[PDB]
Amino acid sequence: MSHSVKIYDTCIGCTQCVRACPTDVLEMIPWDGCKAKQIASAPRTEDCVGCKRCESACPTDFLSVRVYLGPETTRSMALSY
Amino acid sequence: AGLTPCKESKAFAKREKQSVKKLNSSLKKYAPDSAPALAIQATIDKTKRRFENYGKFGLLCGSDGLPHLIVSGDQRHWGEFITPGVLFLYIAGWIGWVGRSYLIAVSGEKKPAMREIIIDVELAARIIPRGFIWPVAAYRELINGDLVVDDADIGY
Amino acid sequence: RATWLPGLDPPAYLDGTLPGDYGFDPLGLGEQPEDLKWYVQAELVHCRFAMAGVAGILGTDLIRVSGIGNLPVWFEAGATKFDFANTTALFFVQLLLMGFVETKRYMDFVSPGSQAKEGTFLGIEASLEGLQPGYPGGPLFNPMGLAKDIENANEVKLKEIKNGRLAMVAMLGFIVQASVTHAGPIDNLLTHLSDPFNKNIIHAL
Amino acid sequence: MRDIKTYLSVAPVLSTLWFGALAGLLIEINRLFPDALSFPFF
Amino acid sequence: EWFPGQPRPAHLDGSSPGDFGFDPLGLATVPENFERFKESEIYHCRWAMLCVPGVLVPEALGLGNWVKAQEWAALPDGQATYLGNPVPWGNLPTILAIEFLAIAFAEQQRTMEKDPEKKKYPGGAFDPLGFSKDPAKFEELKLKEIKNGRLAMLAFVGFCVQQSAYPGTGPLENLATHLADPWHNNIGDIV
Amino acid sequence: KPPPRGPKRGTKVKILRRESYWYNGTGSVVTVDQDPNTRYPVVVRFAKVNYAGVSTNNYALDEIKEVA
Ligand code: CLA
Ligand SMILES: CC(/C=C/C=C(C)/C=C/[C@@]12O[C@]1(C)C[C@@H](O)CC2(C)C)=C\C=C\C=C(C)\C=C\C=C(C)\C=C\[C@@]12O[C@]1(C)C[C@@H](O)CC2(C)C
Ligand SMILES: CC1=C(/C=C/C(C)=C/C=C/C(C)=C\C=C\C=C(C)\C=C\C=C(C)\C=C\C2=C(C)CCCC2(C)C)C(C)(C)CCC1
Ligand code: SF4
Ligand code: SF4
Incomplete structure (x- = not known):
């Protein structure tokens, strides 16, 4: 909600975005719309720093996890002080 | 536009006079037969025959004693712009038309990537002369409608 | 098959039905039918203009020098004048009829036989086609109708081809020959025949 | 021998040779x- | 056909007077564009056929050409001369006002009827004899009109261009000029 | 009993997805998934590479035009 992270239906369940979140935002939930039978999910968008590496590892036509930068909070700005 | 002919412009025949005097100034310091004296003399003759050719081929000179080019197309002056220009356009297509043939030629291979970083010399030798007749060849492509494509652009 | 280059093989598309098929088209200039079909006429029209054209250049200068008659050089003929001939109007006049004859030929190749079914009388029969695109012999264009259209076409056109191919080259000679020598073509021949080992293009430069 | 010719055919080596x-x-x-400022032939 | 050897543009299948397969710019694609063009065509024909002899015959008499016959209006005190006679109403604002009301009204009478066939061939009071009796002959009658009308337009073009090429000339004066030395007086000398 | 759906194999296809990298391009079908619930069955292989280096992805049936 600080930043908005959205995952579409193109996702093929490869678990490459989840493994690449450096602050544990995304996670994997069951589906039935792929051969792998699992689609990603973003239930902890607060801590989302905005580091687009989460979607530099989604290998689809355009993309299946997308990140929109909104307002910035004290943790979405990664302030240590 | 008032540009007098260089063979007439006294300013043109002034610049020719100074640059000769300037060179002959630099010459009356070496030996009358050493290597510098010859190289200086060589450039002196090159200069005089340079000015003469500019006052011979109909170049028009302004008030600066310098040649001016009439690119308007007045065909009294065709060898200044138009004639060299057509000479370029012939060459430029030759480079253009040959390169196009090659890319098409190697297009139908397993990976055209390899045949462009490592150019096929023999294939580029049987294509290097086809640019002698590019105006004829291309103009037929345009009429036949193979010089261009219509809506199939990326991928294939 | 006796190509132009003994060792080299002829290309695959110059099969040989066209007269003067000496397997010669190195630059890949005829590897499409519609291309090749339209190129043949060019060689036919060029050669015929280049057959008469050299003779007009040649014969006129031959008769003048010997002294039977007098005419200007073909190089010098463009500015000639006798009477009632503005080079303006002649250009328009020649452009007209040539424009007329050239087009109706063009319509023939574009549409065979769509040239002799019309209203204008008395001539609507001959200008059909010679039955071979580049040979429109009819009972007006071949007033001595002396062709069988098939047999000699292999053996006589091959004369008219190799005749023309030579003649087109010859005209190219004079243009360059007059461009360098500043003189007449036979003058070039007469000069070279005088001292051949000293009258050569090496000396002309 | 073949490998030498291939190397000589890679793009940079042709470039220096061609240019x-x-x-x-x-x-x-x-x-x-x-000096060649005009093309005075025709 | 005008150009023996080309296929007819599909929308020219006779079905009209004076139609020979000539529409290279495809101007007559739209049938509504097609029909209105016929109107303008016949009118541009109709006016032109009137105007050419009116340009020439005065020159065939002592009267000035089609250019001089408009010149008095240039000077402020212009008065006309019909058959040389100074008609009283020859001043420019006089004829202009007479010209405007009459031309507009009759030509507006055209603009207010839509048959649309009569907009090309009204007849009736315009056919005091009734040449339209034989439909075969009347249909050919249009042809003569169309071809003659097209002939007139070109003659009009020749008259006007010869004036720009030769200011202050007459078509018969131009004709005689060529008639002196056809081979040294031509369209060759313009360019 | 029901036959396989979509193109079989090797059939060139014209891509119709608007946001794809190969829109108005042509690729080769390598396999079609026969599960009805699968939301993007037709696995298309290409000859070029998208900006990520990838050269294949799934596609929907109505975004594939089977050229021949
Ligand atoms: C076969 C070679 C070739 C051909 C036919 C074209 C053709 C074209 N290019 Mg081009 N281009 C090329 C190579 C070529 N390009 C290369 C190698 C580059 C990288 C520098 C570019 C960069 C380039 C740009 C930036 C632009 C074009 C544009 C254009 C178009 C207009 C022409 C123009 O502006 O020329 C441009 C000419 C140059 C930029 C000069 C460089 C081209 C080199 C010198 C030619 C290379 C030839 C090749 C190496 C020889 C192969 C021989 C073979 C036997 C091995 C036209 C479709 C313009 C366009 O879109 O217009 C519609 C445009 O903006 N091109
Ligand atoms: C038409 C022609 C000349 C016609 C001459 C005429 C009308 C002369 C007219 C006049 O003299 C008179 C009568 C009287 C004078 O008072 C007036 C003028 C005007 C002066 C010459 C053609 C001359 C044409 C020539 C010479 C063409 C040569 C073409 C070659 C060599 C092409 C070869 C290739 O195309 C192939 C064959 C295969 C490819 O794969 C390889 C390559 C090499 C590309
Ligand atoms: C005359 C003159 C002038 C002018 C000019 C102009 C004005 C021009 C224009 C021009 C134009 C307006 C053009 C256009 C164009 C278009 C297009 C479209 C083109 C195209 C082309 C192409 C397409 C080609 C291709 C190719 C070839 C063929 C070869 C090479 C290879 C390639 C493939 C590339 C001046 C004044 C300067 C001077 C004087 C002279
Ligand atoms: S931007 Fe960073 S924090 Fe946010 S989801 Fe992507 S990888 Fe995780
Ligand atoms: S990276 Fe993309 S395709 Fe892979 S699991 Fe995440 S969203 Fe799905």
């Missing part, structure tokens, strides 16, 4: 027809 020939040609022409 070098081109440089030599233009330098020669300027040595024989210098």
